[PDB]
Design an enzyme around this catalytic site. Structure first.
Site, PDB file in Angstrom:
ATOM      1  N   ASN A 123     -11.314  -6.640   0.261  1.00 23.00           N
ATOM      2  CA  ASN A 123     -10.469  -7.635   0.091  1.00 23.00           C
ATOM      3  C   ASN A 123     -10.823  -9.059  -0.612  1.00 23.00           C
ATOM      4  O   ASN A 123     -10.193  -9.633  -1.457  1.00 23.00           O
ATOM      5  CB  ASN A 123      -9.942  -8.159   1.535  1.00 23.00           C
ATOM      6  CG  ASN A 123      -9.313  -7.129   2.421  1.00 23.00           C
ATOM      7  OD1 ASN A 123      -8.254  -6.770   1.976  1.00 23.00           O
ATOM      8  ND2 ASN A 123      -9.897  -6.769   3.317  1.00 23.00           N
TER       9      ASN A 123
ATOM     10  N   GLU B  30       2.961 -13.913 -21.015  1.00 22.44           N
ATOM     11  CA  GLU B  30       2.387 -13.713 -22.388  1.00 22.44           C
ATOM     12  C   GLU B  30       1.442 -12.301 -22.240  1.00 22.44           C
ATOM     13  O   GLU B  30       1.784 -11.633 -23.302  1.00 22.44           O
ATOM     14  CB  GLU B  30       1.302 -14.794 -22.327  1.00 22.44           C
ATOM     15  CG  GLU B  30       1.820 -16.157 -22.832  1.00 22.44           C
ATOM     16  CD  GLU B  30       1.912 -16.530 -24.243  1.00 22.44           C
ATOM     17  OE1 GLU B  30       1.976 -17.535 -24.447  1.00 22.44           O
ATOM     18  OE2 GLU B  30       1.869 -15.721 -24.954  1.00 22.44           O
TER      19      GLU B  30
ATOM     20  N   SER C 180       0.804  -1.148   0.060  1.00 21.48           N
ATOM     21  CA  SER C 180      -0.002  -0.182   0.007  1.00 21.48           C
ATOM     22  C   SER C 180       0.676   1.231  -0.001  1.00 21.48           C
ATOM     23  O   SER C 180       1.998   1.283   0.373  1.00 21.48           O
ATOM     24  CB  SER C 180      -0.820  -0.034   1.207  1.00 21.48           C
ATOM     25  OG  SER C 180      -0.216  -0.285   2.349  1.00 21.48           O
TER      26      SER C 180
ATOM     27  N   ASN D  79      -8.996   3.032  -3.498  1.00 18.19           N
ATOM     28  CA  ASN D  79      -9.880   2.585  -2.775  1.00 18.19           C
ATOM     29  C   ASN D  79     -11.342   3.307  -2.982  1.00 18.19           C
ATOM     30  O   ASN D  79     -12.278   2.549  -2.285  1.00 18.19           O
ATOM     31  CB  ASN D  79      -9.498   3.023  -0.953  1.00 18.19           C
ATOM     32  CG  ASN D  79      -8.631   2.082  -0.447  1.00 18.19           C
ATOM     33  OD1 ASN D  79      -8.550   0.937  -0.804  1.00 18.19           O
ATOM     34  ND2 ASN D  79      -7.919   2.673   0.370  1.00 18.19           N
TER      35      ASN D  79
ATOM     36  N   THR E  66      -6.700   8.850   4.522  1.00 17.17           N
ATOM     37  CA  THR E  66      -6.788   8.457   5.974  1.00 17.17           C
ATOM     38  C   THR E  66      -5.433   9.109   6.691  1.00 17.17           C
ATOM     39  O   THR E  66      -5.306   9.076   7.879  1.00 17.17           O
ATOM     40  CB  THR E  66      -6.441   6.973   6.160  1.00 17.17           C
ATOM     41  OG1 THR E  66      -5.143   6.546   5.292  1.00 17.17           O
ATOM     42  CG2 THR E  66      -7.581   6.179   5.512  1.00 17.17           C
TER      43      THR E  66
HETATM   44  N1  LIG Z   1      -7.841  -1.752  -0.051  1.00 16.56           N
HETATM   45  C1  LIG Z   1      -7.520  -1.790   1.062  1.00 16.56           C
HETATM   46  N2  LIG Z   1      -6.649  -0.931   1.519  1.00 16.56           N
HETATM   47  C2  LIG Z   1      -6.475  -1.280   2.901  1.00 16.56           C
HETATM   48  C3  LIG Z   1      -6.770  -2.132   3.664  1.00 16.56           C
HETATM   49  N3  LIG Z   1      -6.366  -2.083   4.986  1.00 16.56           N
HETATM   50  C4  LIG Z   1      -5.560  -1.120   4.947  1.00 16.56           C
HETATM   51  N4  LIG Z   1      -5.530  -0.521   3.782  1.00 16.56           N
HETATM   52  C5  LIG Z   1      -4.718   0.743   3.249  1.00 16.56           C
HETATM   53  O1  LIG Z   1      -3.576   0.980   4.044  1.00 16.56           O
HETATM   54  C6  LIG Z   1      -3.298   1.977   4.243  1.00 16.56           C
HETATM   55  C7  LIG Z   1      -2.501   2.221   5.511  1.00 16.56           C
HETATM   56  O2  LIG Z   1      -0.945   1.963   5.163  1.00 16.56           O
HETATM   57  P1  LIG Z   1      -0.309   0.619   5.735  1.00 16.56           P
HETATM   58  O3  LIG Z   1       0.113  -0.465   4.522  1.00 16.56           O
HETATM   59  O4  LIG Z   1      -1.616  -0.135   6.520  1.00 16.56           O
HETATM   60  O5  LIG Z   1       0.812   1.241   6.567  1.00 16.56           O
HETATM   61  P2  LIG Z   1       0.867   0.772   8.020  1.00 16.56           P
HETATM   62  O6  LIG Z   1       0.819  -0.753   8.352  1.00 16.56           O
HETATM   63  O7  LIG Z   1      -0.308   1.382   8.875  1.00 16.56           O
HETATM   64  O8  LIG Z   1       2.336   1.506   8.437  1.00 16.56           O
HETATM   65  P3  LIG Z   1       2.663   1.026  10.062  1.00 16.56           P
HETATM   66  O9  LIG Z   1       1.507   1.618  10.823  1.00 16.56           O
HETATM   67  O10 LIG Z   1       3.842   1.796  10.392  1.00 16.56           O
HETATM   68  O11 LIG Z   1       2.768  -0.387  10.066  1.00 16.56           O
HETATM   69  C8  LIG Z   1      -4.690   2.964   4.427  1.00 16.56           C
HETATM   70  O12 LIG Z   1      -4.626   4.216   3.675  1.00 16.56           O
HETATM   71  C9  LIG Z   1      -5.530   2.132   3.629  1.00 16.56           C
HETATM   72  O13 LIG Z   1      -5.607   2.683   2.324  1.00 16.56           O
HETATM   73  C10 LIG Z   1      -7.739  -3.315   3.136  1.00 16.56           C
HETATM   74  O14 LIG Z   1      -8.094  -4.152   3.742  1.00 16.56           O
HETATM   75  N5  LIG Z   1      -8.179  -2.987   1.797  1.00 16.56           N
END
Ligand SMILES: Nc1nc2c(ncn2[C@@H]2O[C@H](COP(=O)(O)OP(=O)(O)OP(=O)(O)O)[C@@H](O)[C@H]2O)c(=O)[nH]1
Ligand SMILES: Nc1nc2c(ncn2[C@@H]2O[C@H](COP(=O)(O)OP(=O)(O)OP(=O)(O)O)[C@@H](O)[C@H]2O)c(=O)[nH]1
Ligand SMILES: Nc1nc2c(ncn2[C@@H]2O[C@H](COP(=O)(O)OP(=O)(O)O)[C@@H](O)[C@H]2O)c(=O)[nH]1
Ligand SMILES: Nc1nc2c(ncn2[C@@H]2O[C@H](COP(=O)(O)OP(=O)(O)O)[C@@H](O)[C@H]2O)c(=O)[nH]1
Ligand SMILES: [Mg+2]
Ligand SMILES: [Mg+2]
Lengths: 428, 51, 115, 439, 428, 429
Positions: free
Chosen positions: D228, D254, D140, D206, D179
């Site tokens: 998901n 491919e 992400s 999203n 967010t």
């Molecule tokens: N599409 C989708 N996006 C998600 C989901 N869960 C979290 N996100 C995205 O993840 C983003 C947060 O970034 P993360 O990859 O979770 O980074 P993080 O784990 O919070 O980083 P740390 O707190 O330091 O561990 C949010 O802005 C969401 O957009 C999900 O279940 N589906």
């Protein structure tokens, strides 16, 4: 004693050729286990043109099946007639071509071409006298068009006086199913005009219009389009295996046909193709079979040959018929239509008859036309290659392993002349 | 030529039999699956009320 | 509990997808508590007779393994081949060379080497 | 034989992998504790689980995946949840203290203590099995370890493996729905590795999934579980041609050469067409020619950019189920008939078509329906150029007043890396311009 | 030996065309599957004229049915006899005709003109000789006019020697079935004069005339209206088809009737008609047969014969009958009144008498009559068309079709000279 | 080949697409489940023997969707065609076209673009709305504006309720019912007007049912729209279509105004007497003292007369009865049409509906004449738009979102020219 070897190339050839052995073995009377249980007596008299012997009176077909992915070989072995092929005769790589002609010509397929020829030299050793090899591939993809060409230019160099024959799926004009088609098709005609004695043009768009307008099918899948090609490959060489009046082999159809040694791209067609509602309604006579051969619908290539003159025309009839009705009915074509025929050949028609019809018909033919309309799909392939190559659309996937760019503008040098050579022989 | 004629009609009969079989059984299986949907929906509603 | 009874099927589907009662590892429908975490909703219910796949087309590889064990074929033999004959006879045997190798028809007038 | 390795990074990527490995387990017969449940019953014709599982000595299948997190809490729901008896306990790699919305923490000072573990555990997995079509990672943009460690994983994984292909899956910020205030600072600056060191980098917003649920389906208020499940049906459609055979099948090699014209234009979209509520699947037809006209609708895209403004460079079509090849070729020529659907002047061919015989499977409790037909439409489009035009403007508006910078610069990050990322994306706004005009 | 190909188009052309080959096969005696059901061997001599010998004792229609709308194809296949019809001879379009000549002749005639013409050139080429030809079509409706008269001109280039002919239906000039049918019918007969060689035209006003006052049979449908034509239009080709005492061709009757090949406008009608109540009162002699074609109680078409003089008459017969009272009946109608006959040319008749009658009737006949009465129906059209061309309303449909307002004024002067041509041939 | 794919816009449009589809769905054997090829004109097919009528239930008021859906016919009209707005337009062309009308075009594009794929050859579009309501005058207008750009020459006919000069339901209704036809003369092919006072006239004196509801007036429009488009669906003695009278009833692209009238309006107290002969039923068409627009034709031009028939029809009495029309002169003679008729004959007699209003009927004929009588009775609404555009009333809610005051006189001069050309057509040719 005149026997041939049936090479199969790529994944499109393995749908053609696996359906080719379920048609020949229907004709020669072989079970899927490989043991003869047939009706007549001259049926296995010339079994050795294609097949071979084993212990205990079981017959194995001879072939070699190539691929660059191991998924197809398991599919062929699990087929209906997939038991009879020898397991040594399958050869396959481990990493696919990925629709890249350059991968299938230089880096992914050249490891394999030194192993296919060891099978081929083992099958060509067993002969009495070879009539010529035979290949089945596709001009749209990567592993049929690259390595299937690299088989040709290495077989031809080490067997120079045999009658090489091919069967080509020419790409469609616009109803197409690969983004990188014209790089794949223009780079293969560059090596297919100078190494093949005959080559057949099989449109995948004329193979749907047959299956809608003269057969009237409902869901035409790939299971029967392999069958329409596989009746023409049996139909050309029926004169080789079975007797008759005015036989014409795989070679004597070449001599009469190609007037100048770069114009060997044909267009075939099969004569009785009748809808299952109108099976009651077709009349079995020799003139009614001839109007299907020269109809514009049963052309099976991508261009209508009313836009020019036929150069030479074949007709390999099969069955029981008077050979006066054969040689008069071809004459009535050349007089009713005269402007559509080249006038510096005083007779444009080669005929042939054999006495053993296909299973389930009284009589059948196989049209072969060397029309001058075949320049048209050569222009439409070349125009979709000189638009990509203005600003190098997909070129970096091909260039990065060793093909420099000048072997792409060399291709159109060996392609834009062949458009012109049909035009100077079009008239005067 | 007549034995070709009966072979043609036999293929017609086989085709229409297969078409009606596919229509009939796949509509029945769709009805079965939709009764399953109704049952699971009402169970989840009772779960909501209990919580 | 028998999916060929409930649904029609292609007769080559394996018994695992035929009988759904054997998938005993899933969660056991606990009545809800307040401390109900949300990531535990993934895979919370076992498959039932409705969700089994009707047809199955997996890729077998048994033949491909049992052929490509070792190496592919390659010719390491000495150069063994007979140059064959043009005429069809089991007694007449002539090639591009040695055109005079045949059983002579018994000429009465003279021995056959005198033309 | 034809395998893949699924490397999951971060809190977003782990909760994709809770949805994928639920759904691959349903597609085969595998129970949540391994144990192919055949008991003294004979069977023949199998090995459709080599692409994502490994049959071990005891008869227990263990998948090829490493789960990487810098947070302890997300992964420890797997270690105590239902699938605890499926993953090998070395393959749930857990961090100790998180990145906390920081590129500089996730790439310079916290991932240094953990990168020695993951590159040992990946090399254990790949040496084990024959071939490798390619990794399929999940991350992400808007978070620290989702875009920091991912930017350090991809620089190191492109050196020592190289010619084996990669894929890349992204969570991309919205125009409206955000967010974090750190969201533009790290969605600009993560492109120094997802340009050089990714072969295809798929793009998912999203915001459209928040809107595709309220309009096709009769669902309101959808949570993160329902996001998901939808992206689990994309990854189980790209890779479906590896396992279950078809008439026209595309591998991972491919569609790579049929979809990216130049090696800096690897940002395709993706759509899933027959998304429909399970009540509404009773109603309409969802034919072979219905669901391909729906792929190009602006209401049913994946990133909120207007598709009626750019030109389509290439399209790859991934059909699934009972599809005949005549009905596909009737569909494509109808799209080129209509003249509000725009293709680039040097591409008359246009399309790549794949067909698999396996029907799209259902998930229990899932709001997706059971339909005999499906398609996943991949496309590379000029309209995604107008999607960075709402992120460069949110970066320089931030950067001029130098807000939120002192966290990054105190962790081994220099200030010359901020403005270097801004020119490297303002350069790409001309690469998506210069191939737009006609000749 | 002589063969006949059939072209057929549209909806009203099909409804007349499905009934025609239903009652063709009564005297030929053909199974509703298609095999032989002949009751005598003199009825099986020149069945080959209309039918090809499909194998099995089978026979097929040598007839092409086209339509641009499949919604009236089911009115033909679900007929009482519609299992003879070959499915290849069906070809169907997807775009509607729109009840328009100009849509059907310019716009939607353009795509399918090559598809029909290649099929008709397919079927007509296998003839040893084509004797006669026909087309069943209408003038009040669109693709029966549009596709009906376009394709006569396209074969007219390729086949100019063999005789084409027209069985056409004028729309009802008393009560209209389209409001503005001077735009439909007159713009299609403008093509038709130089397209064809001869014209047969029956109108529904003469058909509703018979069943009201003459046949005493209330409630006739279009299956009753199709029974005064489908034996009539098989009633001129009798002596070629079934062998007779004085056998005649189809072309040779068209040869003997005229010294000047300019004009050709006929009117068909069947002679042996009297009420089913009067079925046993009124079967007396062959003079009772001749007193029906001559009298206008039989109205053939909508034009009334009593208005003007006849330049010629023609009276064909089927079945064994006398000779001296054939000589009497052409004399006794001369002596009492001579206003019908022209006073310059004395000899007019073409009396072809066959041997074979139809089943159920013993003394059959058919009347084709040339006079100056076809002028009358076009003259009120020249009172209809000039009332609507002076305001130019529905022509707003016709501007965007692909043509100008100058084809309208030029085509009416291609008819208004013919009205002047008829009226000065009638004089002096 | 026979398919009239429709789209509904309005509370009026979806109430009509309830109670005309009563007879449409009893003409075939679909009971309200949606289960069991004449049906393929309307009904699509699923895989599993289930249908969808190719229609869209667009409306911005959120009441008519729930009220239609809570009937017997719940899962018949399937719920994804049901396009609902959040707040209604409420006699406002500006709300229904500009500030709320631009919001749901992205929905109506899906639900009218996907329907084109499911027929063999699409015939055309009949559309349903009304003129005295803003969201039925606005989305229909914008629908025609977008769709005739995108598709073009497809068939386009309108169903609507026109204000008869005695009684009406909204105050300034001659505004909003006269602005919205600046696009019906541009992007569509034909137009139907049915005023409810001309049905209140007939529903006492031809069926003996005092006090009729609008849901009783919603069924004589069904007994029109049965025989109009039902000739497509069943092979009659002459299989006539709607592109047919699209061509045939249009002499000019301005004067597309037909007049609808259906013969069997008889009671069960009256069904002891009518012989259902062609003469009496075509009298019940062409005596317009009892027809469905309230304009007496005795100052109009008697131009183009389409007559559709369903049932026990004989062509000799059809051609005797149309000749019988041609005998008497109280229907006089237009100059440039000598005959100007059309006969259409269909072999399914119409279905008697339970809960219906009349008795057993064997024979059906409906007429569409082009007549300038209602073209000259357009002058009452044209003249009494001026009496309320002399004093600047109600314009403020219009003008806020885009009904600026130039368009209000643009439509006035545009539609005074229409009467000025009606007068020259009514001048004898
Ligand atoms: N599409 C989708 N996006 C998600 C989901 N869960 C979290 N996100 C995205 O993840 C983003 C947060 O970034 P993360 O990859 O979770 O980074 P993080 O784990 O919070 O980083 P740390 O707190 O330091 O561990 C949010 O802005 C969401 O957009 C999900 O279940 N589906
Ligand atoms: N005859 C008939 N008229 C109807 C029907 N439904 C509504 N109307 C007419 O419609 C007029 C006002 O209703 P609408 O046109 O729908 O106006 P509206 O309610 O503001 O429309 P929306 O706001 O779009 O829902 C009234 O004159 C009614 O006569 C119906 O079912 N039958
Ligand atoms: N005639 C025919 N063509 C096929 C069949 N299967 C695939 N093709 C064609 O093969 C082309 C692509 O072939 P491809 O799979 O790339 O061949 P490969 O490169 O050798 O693997 C497409 O244009 C298809 O039309 C078949 O069964 N019959
Ligand atoms: N005699 C006869 N006339 C017919 C038949 N079908 C249609 N017509 C006539 O054709 C004229 C116009 O019919 P129409 O359907 O509009 O013509 P089409 O569209 O070309 O089929 C009318 O005068 C009808 O009387 C038929 O089967 N027999
Ligand atoms: Mg993170
Ligand atoms: Mg409303």
């Amino acid at each position: 004693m005149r026997e041939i070897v049936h090479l199969q190339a790529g994944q499109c050839g393995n749908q053609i050729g696996a359906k080719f052995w379920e048609v020949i073995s229907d004709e020669h009377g072989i079970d899927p286990t490989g043991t003869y249980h047939g009706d007549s007596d001259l049926q296995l008299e010339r079994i050795n043109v294609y097949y071979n012997e084993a212990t205990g009176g079981k017959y194995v077909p001879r072939a070699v099946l190539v691929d660059l992915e191991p998924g197809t070989m398991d599919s062929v072995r699990s087929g209906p007639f997939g038991q009879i092929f020898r397991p040594d005769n399958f050869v396959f790589g481990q990493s696919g071509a990925g629709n890249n002609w350059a991968k299938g010509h230089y880096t992914e397929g050249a490891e394999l071409v030194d192993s296919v020829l060891d099978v081929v030299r083992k099958e060509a050793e067993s002969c009495d006298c070879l009539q010529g090899f035979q290949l089945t591939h596709s001009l749209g993809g990567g592993t049929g068009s690259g390595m299937g060409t690299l088989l040709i230019s290495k077989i031809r160099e080490e067997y120079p006086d045999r009658i090489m024959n091919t069967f080509s799926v020419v790409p469609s004009p616009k109803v197409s199913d690969t983004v990188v088609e014209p790089y794949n098709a223009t780079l293969s005609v560059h090596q297919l005009v100078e190494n093949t004695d005959e080559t057949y043009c099989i449109d995948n768009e004329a193979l749907y219009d047959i299956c809608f307008r003269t057969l009237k099918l409902t869901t035409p899948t790939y299971g029967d389009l392999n069958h329409l090609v596989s009746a023409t490959m049996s139909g050309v060489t029926t004169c080789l295996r079975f007797p008759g009046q005015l036989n014409a082999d795989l070679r004597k159809l070449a001599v009469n046909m190609v007037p100048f040694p770069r114009l060997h791209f044909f267009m075939p067609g099969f004569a009785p193709l009748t809808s299952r509602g109108s099976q009651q309604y077709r009349a079995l006579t020799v003139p009614e079979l001839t109007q299907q051969m020269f109809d514009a619908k049963n052309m099976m290539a991508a261009c209508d040959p009313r836009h020019g003159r036929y150069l030479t025309v074949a007709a390999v009839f099969r069955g029981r018929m008077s050979m006066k009705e054969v040689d008069e009915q071809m004459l009535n074509v050349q007089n009713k239509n005269s402007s559509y025929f080249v006038e510096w050949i005083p007779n444009n028609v080669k005929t042939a008859v054999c006495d053993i019809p296909p299973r389930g018909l009284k009589m059948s033919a196989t049209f072969i036309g060397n029309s001058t309309a075949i320049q048209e799909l050569f222009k439409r392939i070349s125009e979709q290659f000189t638009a990509m190559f203005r600003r190098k659309a997909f070129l970096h996937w091909y260039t990065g392993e060793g093909m420099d760019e000048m072997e792409f503008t060399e291709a159109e040098s060996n392609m834009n002349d062949l458009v012109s050579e049909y035009q100077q022989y079009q008239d005067a | 030529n007549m034995k070709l004629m009966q072979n043609a009609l036999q293929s017609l009969q086989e085709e229409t039999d297969k078409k009606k079989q596919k229509k009939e059984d796949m509509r029945r299986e769709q009805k079965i699956y939709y009764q399953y949907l109704a049952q699971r929906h009402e169970e989840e509603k009772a779960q909501e009320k209990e919580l | 509990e028998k999916t060929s009874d409930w649904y029609r099927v292609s007769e080559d589907l394996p018994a695992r997808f035929n009988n759904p009662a054997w998938f005993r590892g899933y969660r056991t429908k606990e009545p809800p508590s307040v401390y109900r975490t949300s990531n535990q909703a993934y895979g919370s219910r076992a498959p039932t007779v409705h969700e089994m796949p009707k047809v199955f087309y997996p890729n077998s590889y048994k033949f491909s393994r049992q052929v490509a064990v070792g190496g592919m074929f390659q010719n390491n033999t000495l150069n063994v081949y007979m140059e064959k004959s043009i005429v069809t006879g089991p007694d007449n045997y002539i090639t591009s060379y040695d055109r005079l190798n045949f059983h002579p028809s018994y000429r009465v007038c003279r021995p056959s080497i005198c033309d | 034989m034809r395998e893949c390795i699924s490397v999951h990074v971060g809190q977003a990527g782990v909760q994709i992998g809770n949805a994928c490995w639920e759904l691959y387990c349903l597609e085969h017969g595998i129970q949540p504790d391994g144990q192919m449940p055949s008991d003294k019953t004979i069977g023949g014709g199998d090995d459709s689980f080599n692409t994502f599982f490994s049959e071990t000595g005891a008869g227990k299948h263990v998948p090829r995946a490493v789960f990487v997190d810098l947070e302890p809490t997300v992964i420890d729901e797997v270690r105590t949840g239902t699938y605890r008896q499926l993953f090998h306990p070395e393959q749930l790699i857990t961090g100790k203290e998180d990145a906390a919305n920081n590129y500089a923490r996730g790439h310079y000072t916290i991932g240094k203590e953990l990168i020695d573990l993951v590159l040992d555990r990946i090399r254990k997995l790949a040496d084990q099995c024959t071939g490798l079509q390619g990794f399929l990672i999940f991350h992400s943009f808007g978070g620290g370890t989702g875009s920091g460690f991912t930017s350090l994983l991809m620089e190191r994984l492109s050196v020592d493996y190289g010619k084996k292909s990669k894929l890349e899956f992204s969570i991309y910020p919205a125009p409206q729905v955000s967010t974090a205030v750190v969201e533009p600072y790290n969605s600009i600056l993560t492109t120094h590795t997802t340009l050089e060191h990714s072969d295809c980098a798929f793009m998912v917003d999203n915001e459209a999934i928040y809107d595709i649920c309220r309009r096709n389906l009769d669902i309101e208020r959808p949570t993160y579980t329902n996001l998901n499940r939808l992206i689990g049906q994309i990854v189980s459609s790209i890779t479906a041609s590896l396992r279950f055979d078809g008439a026209l099948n595309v591998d991972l090699t491919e569609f790579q050469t049929n979809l990216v014209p130049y090696p800096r234009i690897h940002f395709p979209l993706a759509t899933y067409a027959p998304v429909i509520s399970a009540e509404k699947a009773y109603h309409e037809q969802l034919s072979v020619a219905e669901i391909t006209n729906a792929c190009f609708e602006p209401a049913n895209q994946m990133v909120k950019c207007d598709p009626r403004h750019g030109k389509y460079m290439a399209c790859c079509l991934l059909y699934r189920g009972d599809v005949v090849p005549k009905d596909v070729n009737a569909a494509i020529a109808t799209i080129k008939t209509k003249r509000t659907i725009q293709f680039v002047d040097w591409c008359p061919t246009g399309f790549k078509v794949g067909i698999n015989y396996q029907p799209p499977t259902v998930v229990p409790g899932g709001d997706l329906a059971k339909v005999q037909r499906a398609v996943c439409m991949l496309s590379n489009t000029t309209a995604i150029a107008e999607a960075w035009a709402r992120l460069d403007h949110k970066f320089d508006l931030m950067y001029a007043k130098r807000a939120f910078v002192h966290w990054y610069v105190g962790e081994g990050m220099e200030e010359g890396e901020f403005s270097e990322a801004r020119e490297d994306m303002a350069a790409l706004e001309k690469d998506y311009e210069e191939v737009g005009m006609d000749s």
